Amino acid sequence: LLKPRTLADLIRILHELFAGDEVNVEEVQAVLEAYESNPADWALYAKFDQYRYTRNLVDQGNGKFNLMILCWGEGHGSSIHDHTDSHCFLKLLQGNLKETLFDWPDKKSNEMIKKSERTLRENQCAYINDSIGLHRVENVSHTEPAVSLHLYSPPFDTCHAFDQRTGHKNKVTMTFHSKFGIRTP
Ligand SMILES: [Fe+3]
């Protein structure tokens, strides 16, 4: 377990950690957090959109994980979502994001109430899965875009969004804005 000097070193260390069948969550998280964000490494991937956050595939981890870069303009946020029974790691490359944690609702139609909120700041790494709960991620800054590195294992194409007033959920299909530095409409 060595320090990733560059995003390309990190990706090679991640391939080594996902060699087996099972995941060492704490080791993944330590090494993601040890990579010092350098914009020259991931410039190619930071493709923003005026209206919402963009998802930009970086590496597909020999089928074991998706590594992607999320770009969040001012005020861009996600909905309340689960992660499809996968692991989710989230490292901040630039700016800050607010994360809000929710519990799985009851089949009762009811407002969903926050368990907790917190700020994720530059270079920190957060971890979530469905057994911890639901969450919402947002760039609440009026001035500064945010960029995060995201790692999901196993990969998933879809997830569920939750309406905060009802807890009712809807299945959603992930879109890539770009793959490997190349935009894809
Ligand atoms: Fe998420």
UniProtKB/Swiss-Prot annotation:
Where does the record put the 3'-(S-cysteinyl)-tyrosine (Cys-Tyr) cross-link? 88-152
Q: State its Enzyme Commission number(s).
A: 1.13.11.20
- What does the UniProt induction comment state? By increase of sulfur amino acid intake.
Could you tell me in which tissues this protein is expressed? Highest levels in liver. Significant expression also in kidney, lung and brain.
Q: Which SUPFAM superfamilies match?
A: RmlC-like cupins (SSF51182)
Its UniProt pathway annotation is: Organosulfur biosynthesis; taurine biosynthesis; hypotaurine from L-cysteine: step 1/2
Alphabetized Gene3D superfamilies for the sequence: Jelly Rolls
In the record's cofactor note, how is the cofactor described as bound? Answer: Binds 1 Fe cation per subunit. Ni(2+) and Zn(2+) can be used to a lesser extent.
- PTM description: The thioether cross-link between Cys-88 and Tyr-152 plays a structural role through stabilizing the Fe(2+) ion, and prevents the production of highly damaging free hydroxyl radicals by holding the oxygen radical via hydroxyl hydrogen.
Cofactor names from the entry are: Fe cation; Ni(2+); Zn(2+)
One Pfam assignment: CDO_I
The family annotation for this protein states:
Belongs to the cysteine dioxygenase family.
Q: Which PANTHER family match?
A: CYSTEINE DIOXYGENASE (PTHR12918), CYSTEINE DIOXYGENASE TYPE 1 (PTHR12918:SF1)
Tell me, what does this protein do in biology? Catalyzes the oxidation of cysteine to cysteine sulfinic acid with addition of molecular dioxygen.
Protein name, per record: Cysteine dioxygenase type 1
